[PDB]
mmCIF file of C-alpha atoms in Angstrom:
data_model
loop_
_atom_site.group_PDB
_atom_site.id
_atom_site.type_symbol
_atom_site.label_atom_id
_atom_site.label_comp_id
_atom_site.label_asym_id
_atom_site.label_seq_id
_atom_site.Cartn_x
_atom_site.Cartn_y
_atom_site.Cartn_z
ATOM 1 C CA UNK A 174 0.000 0.000 0.000
ATOM 2 C CA UNK A 175 1.424 3.371 -1.086
ATOM 3 C CA UNK A 176 -0.470 5.533 1.413
ATOM 4 C CA UNK A 177 -0.013 8.651 -0.679
ATOM 5 C CA UNK A 178 -2.701 10.496 1.284
ATOM 6 C CA UNK A 179 -0.570 10.321 4.416
ATOM 7 C CA UNK A 180 2.463 11.746 2.606
ATOM 8 C CA UNK A 181 0.324 14.457 0.985
ATOM 9 C CA UNK A 182 -1.008 15.377 4.414
ATOM 10 C CA UNK A 183 2.518 15.521 5.792
ATOM 11 C CA UNK A 184 3.566 17.831 2.968
ATOM 12 C CA UNK A 185 0.484 20.039 3.319
ATOM 13 C CA UNK A 186 1.122 20.414 7.065
ATOM 14 C CA UNK A 187 4.720 21.435 6.376
ATOM 15 C CA UNK A 188 3.752 24.113 3.850
ATOM 16 C CA UNK A 189 0.985 25.390 6.152
ATOM 17 C CA UNK A 190 3.501 25.743 8.990
ATOM 18 C CA UNK A 191 6.503 26.962 7.046
ATOM 19 C CA UNK A 192 5.333 28.466 3.760
ATOM 20 C CA UNK A 193 2.419 29.642 1.648
ATOM 21 C CA UNK A 194 -0.430 27.251 0.883
ATOM 22 C CA UNK A 195 -2.280 29.451 -1.602
ATOM 23 C CA UNK A 196 -1.996 28.037 -5.113
ATOM 24 C CA UNK A 197 0.051 25.061 -3.945
ATOM 25 C CA UNK A 198 -0.838 21.667 -5.400
ATOM 26 C CA UNK A 199 0.735 19.177 -2.958
ATOM 27 C CA UNK A 200 -0.283 15.974 -4.715
ATOM 28 C CA UNK A 201 1.250 17.325 -7.939
ATOM 29 C CA UNK A 202 4.539 18.207 -6.269
ATOM 30 C CA UNK A 203 4.656 14.905 -4.381
ATOM 31 C CA UNK A 204 4.059 12.971 -7.605
ATOM 32 C CA UNK A 205 7.209 14.371 -9.208
ATOM 33 C CA UNK A 206 9.312 14.101 -6.050
ATOM 34 C CA UNK A 207 8.421 10.426 -5.594
ATOM 35 C CA UNK A 208 9.533 9.672 -9.149
ATOM 36 C CA UNK A 209 12.808 11.612 -9.157
ATOM 37 C CA UNK A 210 16.150 10.427 -7.775
ATOM 38 C CA UNK A 211 16.588 11.506 -4.147
ATOM 39 C CA UNK A 212 20.266 12.141 -3.511
ATOM 40 C CA UNK A 213 19.811 11.754 0.270
ATOM 41 C CA UNK A 214 18.692 8.164 -0.319
ATOM 42 C CA UNK A 215 21.581 7.415 -2.658
ATOM 43 C CA UNK A 216 19.833 8.385 -5.881
ATOM 44 C CA UNK A 217 16.876 6.031 -5.625
ATOM 45 C CA UNK A 218 13.348 7.191 -6.481
ATOM 46 C CA UNK A 219 11.335 7.391 -3.253
ATOM 47 C CA UNK A 220 8.357 5.611 -4.911
ATOM 48 C CA UNK A 221 10.471 2.444 -5.129
ATOM 49 C CA UNK A 222 10.760 2.295 -1.324
ATOM 50 C CA UNK A 223 7.052 2.551 -0.541
ATOM 51 C CA UNK A 224 6.517 -1.222 -0.754
ATOM 52 C CA UNK A 225 7.837 -1.847 2.778
ATOM 53 C CA UNK A 226 7.087 -0.344 6.182
ATOM 54 C CA UNK A 227 10.807 0.432 6.543
ATOM 55 C CA UNK A 228 10.906 2.196 3.186
ATOM 56 C CA UNK A 229 7.786 4.156 4.115
ATOM 57 C CA UNK A 230 9.509 5.355 7.293
ATOM 58 C CA UNK A 231 12.653 6.333 5.378
ATOM 59 C CA UNK A 232 10.731 8.378 2.811
ATOM 60 C CA UNK A 233 8.594 10.087 5.458
ATOM 61 C CA UNK A 234 11.771 11.005 7.391
ATOM 62 C CA UNK A 235 13.418 12.497 4.314
ATOM 63 C CA UNK A 236 10.288 14.543 3.633
ATOM 64 C CA UNK A 237 10.260 15.755 7.242
ATOM 65 C CA UNK A 238 13.925 16.815 7.037
ATOM 66 C CA UNK A 239 13.009 19.261 4.272
ATOM 67 C CA UNK A 240 11.400 21.289 7.059
ATOM 68 C CA UNK A 241 13.542 20.366 10.076
ATOM 69 C CA UNK A 242 16.858 21.327 8.504
ATOM 70 C CA UNK A 243 18.726 18.251 9.685
ATOM 71 C CA UNK A 244 21.297 17.233 7.119
ATOM 72 C CA UNK A 245 20.381 13.858 5.709
ATOM 73 C CA UNK B 208 36.249 39.631 13.260
ATOM 74 C CA UNK B 209 36.403 37.517 16.424
ATOM 75 C CA UNK B 210 33.710 35.205 15.067
ATOM 76 C CA UNK B 211 33.395 32.801 12.160
ATOM 77 C CA UNK B 212 30.136 32.467 10.265
ATOM 78 C CA UNK B 213 28.385 29.240 9.353
ATOM 79 C CA UNK B 214 25.175 29.007 7.384
ATOM 80 C CA UNK B 215 21.701 27.500 7.310
ATOM 81 C CA UNK B 216 18.852 27.780 4.862
ATOM 82 C CA UNK B 217 15.947 27.296 7.223
ATOM 83 C CA UNK B 218 12.228 27.822 7.739
ATOM 84 C CA UNK B 219 10.116 28.909 10.676
ATOM 85 C CA UNK B 220 7.903 26.141 12.051
ATOM 86 C CA UNK B 221 5.038 26.033 14.514
ATOM 87 C CA UNK B 222 7.162 25.674 17.676
ATOM 88 C CA UNK B 223 10.633 26.855 16.594
ATOM 89 C CA UNK B 224 12.041 29.521 14.269
ATOM 90 C CA UNK B 225 14.613 29.649 11.469
ATOM 91 C CA UNK B 226 17.166 31.240 13.838
ATOM 92 C CA UNK B 227 16.690 28.511 16.457
ATOM 93 C CA UNK B 228 19.837 27.406 18.279
ATOM 94 C CA UNK B 229 18.102 24.824 20.480
ATOM 95 C CA UNK B 230 18.326 22.131 17.781
ATOM 96 C CA UNK B 231 14.561 21.594 17.851
ATOM 97 C CA UNK B 232 14.159 20.544 14.215
ATOM 98 C CA UNK B 233 16.873 17.892 14.192
ATOM 99 C CA UNK B 234 15.576 16.624 17.545
ATOM 100 C CA UNK B 235 12.280 15.819 15.856
ATOM 101 C CA UNK B 236 13.534 14.120 12.702
ATOM 102 C CA UNK B 237 17.041 12.920 13.394
ATOM 103 C CA UNK B 238 19.729 13.299 10.750
ATOM 104 C CA UNK B 239 23.049 11.937 9.494
ATOM 105 C CA UNK B 240 24.746 12.711 12.786
ATOM 106 C CA UNK B 241 21.984 12.501 15.408
ATOM 107 C CA UNK B 242 19.224 10.283 16.751
ATOM 108 C CA UNK B 243 15.608 11.290 17.052
ATOM 109 C CA UNK B 244 15.285 12.882 20.470
ATOM 110 C CA UNK B 245 18.755 14.404 20.540
ATOM 111 C CA UNK B 246 18.945 18.114 19.747
ATOM 112 C CA UNK B 247 21.779 19.269 17.457
ATOM 113 C CA UNK B 248 22.203 22.272 15.156
ATOM 114 C CA UNK B 249 23.372 21.545 11.598
ATOM 115 C CA UNK B 250 25.153 24.322 9.696
ATOM 116 C CA UNK B 251 27.379 24.556 6.625
ATOM 117 C CA UNK B 252 30.767 26.208 6.208
ATOM 118 C CA UNK B 253 29.562 28.082 3.090
ATOM 119 C CA UNK B 254 26.232 29.353 1.846
ATOM 120 C CA UNK B 255 26.761 27.252 -1.295
ATOM 121 C CA UNK B 256 27.114 24.143 0.846
ATOM 122 C CA UNK B 257 23.956 25.027 2.791
ATOM 123 C CA UNK B 258 22.086 25.097 -0.516
ATOM 124 C CA UNK B 259 23.446 21.684 -1.559
ATOM 125 C CA UNK B 260 22.577 20.082 1.805
ATOM 126 C CA UNK B 261 19.154 21.708 2.178
ATOM 127 C CA UNK B 262 17.655 22.059 -1.283
ATOM 128 C CA UNK B 263 19.558 19.884 -3.728
ATOM 129 C CA UNK B 264 20.278 16.833 -1.550
ATOM 130 C CA UNK B 265 16.645 16.513 -0.468
ATOM 131 C CA UNK B 266 15.366 17.513 -3.932
ATOM 132 C CA UNK B 267 13.134 20.051 -2.195
ATOM 133 C CA UNK B 268 12.981 22.680 -4.916
ATOM 134 C CA UNK B 269 9.588 23.923 -6.007
ATOM 135 C CA UNK B 270 8.096 24.070 -2.522
ATOM 136 C CA UNK B 271 6.536 27.414 -1.604
ATOM 137 C CA UNK B 272 8.469 27.552 1.662
ATOM 138 C CA UNK B 273 9.530 30.792 3.301
ATOM 139 C CA UNK B 274 13.213 29.989 3.469
ATOM 140 C CA UNK B 275 15.770 32.201 5.179
ATOM 141 C CA UNK B 276 19.501 32.401 4.955
ATOM 142 C CA UNK B 277 20.548 32.209 8.598
ATOM 143 C CA UNK B 278 24.005 33.341 9.718
ATOM 144 C CA UNK B 279 25.415 31.446 12.683
ATOM 145 C CA UNK B 280 28.157 33.486 14.337
ATOM 146 C CA UNK B 281 30.508 31.240 16.274
ATOM 147 C CA UNK B 282 33.068 32.719 18.698
ATOM 148 C CA UNK B 283 36.548 31.997 17.353
ATOM 149 C CA UNK B 284 37.752 30.672 20.725
ATOM 150 C CA UNK B 285 34.902 28.131 20.730
ATOM 151 C CA UNK B 286 35.676 27.156 17.132
ATOM 152 C CA UNK B 287 39.337 26.774 18.112
ATOM 153 C CA UNK B 288 38.158 24.127 20.591
ATOM 154 C CA UNK B 289 36.096 22.169 18.064
ATOM 155 C CA UNK B 290 36.715 18.547 17.204
ATOM 156 C CA UNK B 291 37.554 18.010 13.542
ATOM 157 C CA UNK B 292 36.422 14.777 11.909
ATOM 158 C CA UNK B 293 37.829 13.966 8.463
ATOM 159 C CA UNK B 294 37.170 11.278 5.864
ATOM 160 C CA UNK B 295 40.537 9.891 6.942
ATOM 161 C CA UNK B 296 39.804 9.507 10.653
ATOM 162 C CA UNK B 297 36.060 8.755 10.640
ATOM 163 C CA UNK B 298 34.797 5.180 10.936
ATOM 164 C CA UNK B 299 34.132 3.423 7.636
ATOM 165 C CA UNK B 300 30.501 3.851 6.646
ATOM 166 C CA UNK B 301 30.079 7.456 7.850
ATOM 167 C CA UNK B 302 29.122 8.374 4.275
ATOM 168 C CA UNK B 303 26.442 5.725 3.703
ATOM 169 C CA UNK B 304 23.349 6.849 1.804
ATOM 170 C CA UNK B 305 20.793 6.758 3.356
ATOM 171 C CA UNK B 306 22.683 7.670 6.533
ATOM 172 C CA UNK B 307 23.065 4.659 8.780
ATOM 173 C CA UNK B 308 24.333 3.557 12.142
ATOM 174 C CA UNK B 309 27.972 4.545 11.628
ATOM 175 C CA UNK B 310 27.475 8.312 11.335
ATOM 176 C CA UNK B 311 24.516 8.377 13.709
ATOM 177 C CA UNK B 312 26.511 6.491 16.361
ATOM 178 C CA UNK B 313 29.585 8.644 15.901
ATOM 179 C CA UNK B 314 27.437 11.756 16.294
ATOM 180 C CA UNK B 315 25.710 10.294 19.329
ATOM 181 C CA UNK B 316 28.945 9.464 21.102
ATOM 182 C CA UNK B 317 30.225 12.968 20.422
ATOM 183 C CA UNK B 318 26.985 14.558 21.672
ATOM 184 C CA UNK B 319 26.582 12.461 24.806
ATOM 185 C CA UNK B 320 30.259 12.536 25.802
ATOM 186 C CA UNK B 321 30.224 16.344 25.498
ATOM 187 C CA UNK B 322 33.869 16.068 24.297
ATOM 188 C CA UNK B 323 33.455 19.471 22.612
ATOM 189 C CA UNK B 324 30.575 21.853 21.920
ATOM 190 C CA UNK B 325 31.357 21.850 18.180
ATOM 191 C CA UNK B 326 32.073 19.046 15.738
ATOM 192 C CA UNK B 327 33.307 19.767 12.199
ATOM 193 C CA UNK B 328 32.362 16.929 9.831
ATOM 194 C CA UNK B 329 32.820 16.301 6.125
ATOM 195 C CA UNK B 330 29.822 16.683 3.886
ATOM 196 C CA UNK B 331 28.699 13.481 2.146
ATOM 197 C CA UNK B 332 28.141 15.699 -0.904
ATOM 198 C CA UNK B 333 31.646 17.221 -0.965
ATOM 199 C CA UNK B 334 33.830 15.329 1.527
ATOM 200 C CA UNK B 335 36.615 17.902 1.288
ATOM 201 C CA UNK B 336 34.340 20.611 2.675
ATOM 202 C CA UNK B 337 32.756 20.808 6.070
ATOM 203 C CA UNK B 338 29.563 21.095 7.996
ATOM 204 C CA UNK B 339 29.325 22.182 11.609
ATOM 205 C CA UNK B 340 27.400 20.405 14.371
ATOM 206 C CA UNK B 341 26.570 22.413 17.512
ATOM 207 C CA UNK B 342 25.578 20.642 20.721
ATOM 208 C CA UNK B 343 23.260 23.143 22.425
ATOM 209 C CA UNK B 344 23.515 21.183 25.703
ATOM 210 C CA UNK B 345 27.252 21.828 25.898
ATOM 211 C CA UNK B 346 28.394 24.655 28.245
ATOM 212 C CA UNK B 347 30.798 26.021 25.625
ATOM 213 C CA UNK B 348 27.946 26.632 23.120
ATOM 214 C CA UNK B 349 27.188 29.789 25.072
ATOM 215 C CA UNK B 350 27.762 32.879 23.013
ATOM 216 C CA UNK B 351 26.810 31.472 19.629
ATOM 217 C CA UNK B 352 24.300 33.710 17.879
ATOM 218 C CA UNK B 353 21.986 33.155 14.937
ATOM 219 C CA UNK B 354 20.056 35.612 12.789
ATOM 220 C CA UNK B 355 17.996 35.624 9.616
ATOM 221 C CA UNK B 356 19.975 37.796 7.235
ATOM 222 C CA UNK B 357 17.775 37.553 4.108
ATOM 223 C CA UNK B 358 15.212 35.450 2.286
ATOM 224 C CA UNK B 359 16.723 32.542 0.400
ATOM 225 C CA UNK B 360 15.214 32.694 -3.078
ATOM 226 C CA UNK B 361 17.438 30.456 -5.199
ATOM 227 C CA UNK B 362 15.349 27.469 -6.141
ATOM 228 C CA UNK B 363 16.447 25.381 -9.129
ATOM 229 C CA UNK B 364 12.818 24.362 -9.737
ATOM 230 C CA UNK B 365 11.513 27.949 -9.712
ATOM 231 C CA UNK B 366 9.123 28.787 -12.543
ATOM 232 C CA UNK B 367 9.647 32.297 -14.005
#
């Protein structure tokens, strides 16, 4: 199970807290991000990790670090 | 100057700000050099490096975030006391992607031992250049200051 809604919600919360929500299409942005290499994860596409609970946790953490400012 | 500047590209959040020195953000998420629950401040030795670590490495361009360039002014006498980790003296595996137990453990031992208030570490992006870790729990971290100096607008996914 991909659970995209949970990741969209996470992203929407982040933009609400830390940016501007007006005009922002979170599912559209998430779609591209999931399908692009993520250097923090060694160049893998995040979508390819969403088939395990561990991979789900890893992707959610990376998304959260966008806001937290921890280096990945 | 009697200080040396390090850099963050950071956002305000609901319970901490971009110029936070309490390490609140990294406490929540963890990072390459810290466990969830341990507060640490991550900064870069150049503004260019802060962009690579913050925007490029997490592929976070295109988000309508209110990002700030934050200057972290570190007293030179505190920097003189920093530990310096290098690719040569770090344990093998520090540069794993995704970050794994080697760098997280190294960072944890440094933080909990309180060996030094500051740890200079190589970037996994450019190992020859450095990031700074600040342990806000360390007595010597007193005197470090942080301020938003401008909006950070450079976003490689920006649409004109």
